[PDB]
């Protein structure tokens, strides 16, 4: 009956927003990460780190605002407010990119707090903790993309900036520099995300079109009671339909719902592994056998060689503006170009 | 209690949203970020 | 006992291991024709002059491709939107050089896939089901129509339809971005929300049902054996699922009606994918993503680049390089 | 017991209120026609081409012959005003009747009168209502024939002299021509009914359609469905709705391709050039430019070995080179003077290109139907400056979208009509589950 | 007997207060000229 | 940086007299340029003849020099080829051809100065971007 | 089905709620406006005004290029606008 148990009582009170011990980590960090992004996208420039405007105050819209990464010259500095770079000056800290690490770091600890919350509530309510386990896939993605990937490169500058169009630029960078679409770990991620969306739609549709008639209304939603013991749709009719339509069907409701967890979670984990390789430029960029043949045989052309020409244009045409610290000067005569264009 | 009818509260709030969003779309054609 | 009535009874029989049906009567030959031609071409077809410039692209395994680089290559830009069946070629050799097989495959496939959707309605009717599973499938089907038929029509050439290949797919989406800025188009943005949200809700629903399975087994058994096919009682506790998820967020952000929950699961990715299919279909007529290039300038009139301008530098790089030999005039107007 | 979000399904069996819904909604259609025209006119500036001004309704009126003269120049905007006002005025009347029948009039009509009342399941009455509307449509098709032959004509982009309003004195009646169009392939170089390239075929087709529709209207008034038709269909309000949803979807897809490819009933003077047209015009432009400099365009070999300006189509016709090789089926009034029996004629190209053709190609090349959602003209990498998206892109995209969703509504309502007719639209009867009485598959 | 200030009260205003503040600042920005 | 009178100061004629535009004139010139010219000359290039641009060094080498208000105002009235040898009013918009180029009809004499002023000012602001094409976007 | 807090729908339809909030909501809106209209937002965050991205005859970006002298580089860039 000491202070610890008294505090435990209060943290675990049933209220509109459950708090819990995990709330002490989750709530401040979630609110600061969110508030950092809203503050920066509304008010803060990227002029000194990127040569870019990036806030509503500067003229940007929702698609173009961003909280951008620090300058390449910062390396992997934590960029703490009180640290040797900003030296406690809030204004300089904003201009040097400090909101980027602020958001990434508080974001990282909020993700941990949210997963602890899933564990905490699951334990108090009496259910198995599979929702927390599935949330490991978003965490793996965040840490590999926002933390591991720039930590293997020269600096934070090459991490994703927190913005709609800034993320689009990240996508296209990865095509032209890493040839990321060719990477089998990304392909496994694509199958997991697309397979998840398919399973989501096909399971939802199946349940809704094998419902039992449990009421007279034309709106079928009213004919369900959360405490009824009876299944609300026919597994038997659903299995027959899919067996005759597609050849196979689910027969076990537990396997089906475990499979729905398994597929997107596994896909995200796979893509995370490939991004860890790209931290080191360990790309699946080429097929060596293709290059040997193509170098010797100028009539040999595939969609593989066509795509590398596209990557080479991306690199040469975006690099000077996208990596301004390198002072790339490419005279017109060195730019790769097809005919006429 | 239930003095102000909720359908009226929703109508007025909804129009307040339309006005602010409309202002933001107007600003895409004037001043900063308009290309002029 | 009449010969036609007995055939009709076999076509629509609910007792065939695989349902045939009247839509199946069109689906089965068209899908077999598309499949057989696809497999043979993927393994063995000679190079195809996709862009009409007498520059053949090698698509098949026997001509130096692997599984990742292989494709059935779209038909020649010289054909445009002209119909090119076998009997219009002077010879199979001509038909192969010019990309005939691509047309045969995609036309038979779009027909058979359309009949696949009809077959889904039809069996649902014979079984006494509700009818709308086929409406969910219309979203992938519309997407296939967009990339194989609609986008060709708008650009004027099946040579700009999507190649039947893994790397050919990547070529298609890189060129699509340089010419339409699809990333900056809201219907593609909604497609991503349809597909990200779909994977999210798949994982959520799977994890919440799995979280609340009623104990029915020992630790030495798969919990899956706690459910028997066709049992009448539910196998999980939706009240416990709701009690957890409502506390994870807040109460009214969680579903306690299983019918509305599963309807939500159906509608979110279906609607998102309808929009992204409409994105491809309307960028077929060159209504492109938002263009904010040089939208921010300073008091003097200097351009102040945003991330949209960096995207444009990337788009420019793809533009100048794609089909590097096909353009003789300064604007790529289709 | 429909929910509020399915609340218009409560009108299925209330013929009086459903009549008001339809008539009120028709007032909305006519209101927008009226209001949009006045908006376009208030913003119209006659010295700018229509397609630089985001106009879609004024081009429809101009095509009927009103307001314009030679070359498509606007001479009098008063016809535009009239069309707008009369539509706007008429919407009040339809609005008035809609709300009366929806709020105050009899909830159901079949008590007030056996003529206006109907049961969806009454196959005789249903085909009678259909027949009346078929006649109305038939009269509608002949109004266009009337305008074309007796009331001033139609704008003709092909008229010698750059286009002009022309009275149609000899509409095409040969059914080999009129129905020949319906049997043309929809693929490239053929184009099904979208290929109609002259006003005589347009007017004659509408004479045929007017007569067919009137004849069909009288047919359906006087008959009831034959037994083979009675066993093949579902006879219910929702089924009829589903059938019309399919027809509207098909029609929207056709309209999409019509505005995208056809430059006869969508004159490029008003709508801007087609995609194929603008791409042909660019090749024309640099052919003209380079030949003025001394280039021999007929013998210039391009990088690939194909001609840089001119090449052969797969069936031999001489055509423009470069990527526009795909668009050689394009036909337009500024280009046809250069065509001989074998395609583009090198001697005409060398000697007979006119300044107006140079102007027209430069105009159409720089007004290709490419633009951003926020109306920045040109390819996606172009900078801001030119505020332009072609009316053809706006009309093609919007109607593809509408056509697609109406196909989905057809599927939705057709499947439901079937299930409601057989009695299982609300779910499976637990005590009588069909699959439970079928043998297992294995 | 309903309380006025709750944990919920704090959560609500923690988000709503700067939201309206930010909306006012963004509105003003639409009238900035270069 | 800002739009100062020095940037708004451009040559009036070949003899070297200068004129200082107002900010109002600059903005009006930009609007009229977009209205009547940008469809072919966006960013100082020429889409239908890329060999000829609106860079000041290009206009200086035209016959009649066109790198000054007078030369440009005259061009908008009676355009010639780059060497001065032929008049091209029938294929290039001009007041002389406002019957066949209707957007030229309602341009007053002061509009012409605003349009010419914009063409001479813009390369001072944008440098290489004016007339550089997509390499500099 | 409730945890003791007052229902939202009861709150926002109540007269007392709207008595307080017809002041607090516009006040916060006005405050945010003045944060921008007084120009204070520029100075707090260091965001360039439309006339202070470049020196008058400059087209080079003032990119930070040192980690530990970065604060002084920004300050030196800014004096080139005074
Ligand atoms: C899942 C669980 C949930 C996760 C929750 C995560 C929340 C916690 C967040 C932790 C924050 C970690 C930031 C560490 C910063 C970093 O690394 O900062 C980087 C510094 C090293 O600094 C870098 O050092 C480099 C090499 O320098 C050396 O080489 C130079 C060239 O010769 C000169 O000689 C120079 O003087 C010499 O020091 C360059 O100078 C870079 O610019 C400079 O940034 O390391 C250091 O702080 C320490 C690095 C050594 C310890 C490694 C710790 C592991 C962290 C990396 C693990 C991923 C590994 C990625 C590899 C792929
Ligand atoms: C009941 C079920 C019906 C089932 C029927 C089964 C067969 C259906 C056939 C559909 C295949 C259509 C291919 C269209 C290819 C194409 O070139 O189509 C375009 C043609 C128009 O063709 C063009 O027509 C042109 C006509 O213009 C000519 O004439 C003009 C006259 O001014 C101009 O002068 C112009 O310059 C000149 O070229 C030329 O001939 C071109 O070469 C030619 O390409 O359109 C058409 O025929 C008009 C109709 C096209 C409809 C196709 C839309 C399909 C939408 C699918 C939606 C999928 C939904 C997913 C479901 C979930
Ligand atoms: C649970 C809440 C939480 C967590 C985990 C974090 C976590 C973090 N914050 Mg955030 N922050 C929070 C709440 C939180 N913050 C709140 C509530 C505010 C509002 C005030 C902020 C405002 C804020 C700013 C402004 C910044 C951070 C930063 C950081 C990072 C560096 C912090 C550091 O080095 O700690 C150092 C401190 C400790 C590890 C605590 C030490 C406690 C030990 C155990 C006891 C020591 C004994 C003591 C000193 C004895 C004193 C005796 C005395 C008599 C002399 C890190 C990601 C920085 C950042 O993001 O960089 C980009 C940064 O600049 N935070
Ligand atoms: C084109 C759009 C359209 C039209 C014409 C209708 C028409 C109708 N609806 Mg439907 N409905 C629609 C859209 C539409 N609805 C949408 C989008 C929804 C979803 C929110 C619904 C949801 C819905 C429900 C849930 C129900 C209906 C019902 C009805 C019918 C009776 C309504 C009634 O008595 O209201 C009474 C309303 C009033 C007295 C308020 C005043 C409304 C008036 C008409 C406004 C007119 C203003 C206008 C400026 C007047 C001009 C005057 C001048 C021209 C003379 C009526 C035929 C009801 C029905 O079937 O009845 C059995 C019903 O239960 N509708
Ligand atoms: C689809 C349209 C439609 C239909 C089927 C009906 C049907 C009906 N209405 Mg409704 N009504 C409509 C439109 C329609 N109305 C419109 C648009 C208005 C507003 C003006 C009204 C206003 C109205 C009132 C005020 C009343 C009815 C009543 C009635 C009933 C008796 C009508 C009668 O005996 O007329 C007999 C036939 C005639 C009087 C001949 C009319 C000749 C018309 C006006 C000329 C032809 C028009 C032409 C074909 C198209 C318009 C031209 C345009 C394109 C420029 C009947 C159920 C009555 C009712 O329900 O009583 C309880 C009633 O009191 N209606
Ligand atoms: C809005 C127009 C409309 C509508 C909805 C109907 C509706 C109906 N008609 Mg009427 N009909 C109409 C106009 C219309 N008609 C007109 C204008 C005429 C005059 C020519 C007729 C002449 C007519 C006759 C002579 C008969 C009907 C009959 C029928 C019924 C059966 C229809 C059926 O099974 O078709 C389904 C169609 C088929 C089974 C055959 C399809 C053949 C086409 C050509 C397939 C091609 C489709 C293809 C994909 C697209 C390309 C088109 C191609 C021609 C190029 C139904 C109530 C029947 C009935 O019971 O009358 C009492 C009947 O015998 N109609
Ligand atoms: C001629 C056209 C037509 C007609 C008359 C009907 C009529 C009907 N439909 Mg069908 N429907 C159609 C087309 C049509 N539909 C199309 C094209 C689709 C595919 C999308 C559907 C899909 C559909 C579904 C899925 C369902 C119906 C249902 C119904 C019934 C109830 C409708 C209702 O109360 O909605 C009430 C109206 C609303 C709730 C408003 C919807 C709001 C829309 C979606 C947003 C509009 C915004 C717009 C896009 C622009 C945004 C800009 C912004 C400023 C707003 C009624 C019999 C229901 C049914 O089966 O009943 C038997 C039902 O569940 N319809
Ligand atoms: C530089 C440092 C910056 C950060 C410093 C750290 C600040 C963090 C403070 C976090 C605590 C704030 C939440 C509590 C506020 C409150 O109103 O509850 C205390 C009281 C609530 O009233 C009561 O509300 C109760 C319900 S509940 O607990 O609020 O859910 C109810 O039981 C009771 O009857 C009623 O009177
Ligand atoms: C960073 C930082 C910090 C923090 C801060 C904060 C925490 C902030 C917050 C902030 C916030 C918190 C903000 C907010 C804002 C908001 C907004 C700005 C919103 C908007 C929205 C909108 C616009 C919407 C709209 C709409 C739509 C569009 C549709 C639907 C409807 C609606 C209405 C929803 C501190 C101090 C610690 C210090 C350090 C730094
Ligand atoms: C039933 C219902 C509904 C619906 C309704 C409707 C839809 C209605 C309609 C209505 C209408 C549809 C209306 C209309 C109106 C109109 C009018 C009223 C007009 C007027 C006009 C005028 C007055 C004009 C004037 C002029 C002139 C003459 C000249 C020029 C100028 C001007 C323009 C000014 C709803 C959903 C809501 C709800 C529920 C129920
Ligand atoms: C005006 C014109 C013209 C003409 C046109 C015409 C003459 C047209 C006709 C059209 C027609 C004449 C059409 C038709 C249509 C048809 C249809 C579209 C059909 C449908 C069908 C169906 C839908 C069916 C179904 C079914 C089956 C299959 C099986 C059994 C069941 C049922 C019945 C469901 C021309 C071009 C010269 C020129 C321009 C103008
Ligand atoms: Cl390519
Ligand atoms: Cl070309
Ligand atoms: Fe489920």
Author numbering:
A (entry chain D): 12 to 352
B (entry chain J): 5 to 40
C (entry chain A): 11 to 344
D (entry chain C): 32 to 473
E (entry chain F): 12 to 45
F (entry chain V): 1 to 137
G (entry chain E): 3 to 84
Question: What did the publication describing this PDB structure actually write?
Answer:
In natural photosynthesis, the light-driven splitting of water into electrons, protons and molecular oxygen forms the first step of the solar-to-chemical energy conversion process. The reaction takes place in photosystem II, where the Mn4CaO5 cluster first stores four oxidizing equivalents, the S0 to S4 intermediate states in the Kok cycle, sequentially generated by photochemical charge separations in the reaction center and then catalyzes the O–O bond formation chemistry. Here, we report room temperature snapshots by serial femtosecond X-ray crystallography to provide structural insights into the final reaction step of Kok’s photosynthetic water oxidation cycle, the S3→[S4]→S0 transition where O2 is formed and Kok’s water oxidation clock is reset. Our data reveal a complex sequence of events, which occur over micro- to milliseconds, comprising changes at the Mn4CaO5 cluster, its ligands and water pathways as well as controlled proton release through the hydrogen-bonding network of the Cl1 channel.
Importantly, the extra O atom Ox, which was introduced as a bridging ligand between Ca and Mn1 during the S2→S3 transition, disappears or relocates in parallel with Yz reduction starting at approximately 700 μs after the third flash. At 730 μs, the O5, W2 and W3 densities become anisotropic, all pointing toward a region between these three oxygen atoms, which indicates increased mobility of these ligands. At the same time, the Ox density is also highly anisotropic. This movement of all four oxygen atoms is likely related to the formation of the water oxidation intermediate. The change in distance we observe for Yz–D1-H190 between 500 and 730 μs suggests that the reduction of Yzox takes place during this time, through the electron transfer from the OEC to Yz. Thus, the data demonstrate that Yzox reduction by the Mn4CaO5-Ox cluster starts only after around 500 μs 16,21,22 and appears to be complete by the 1,200-μs time point. Consistent with the high mobility observed for the W1 and W2 water ligands, the connection between D1-D170 and Ca appears to be weakened between 730 and 2,000 μs and is only fully restored at the S0 state (3F(200 ms)).
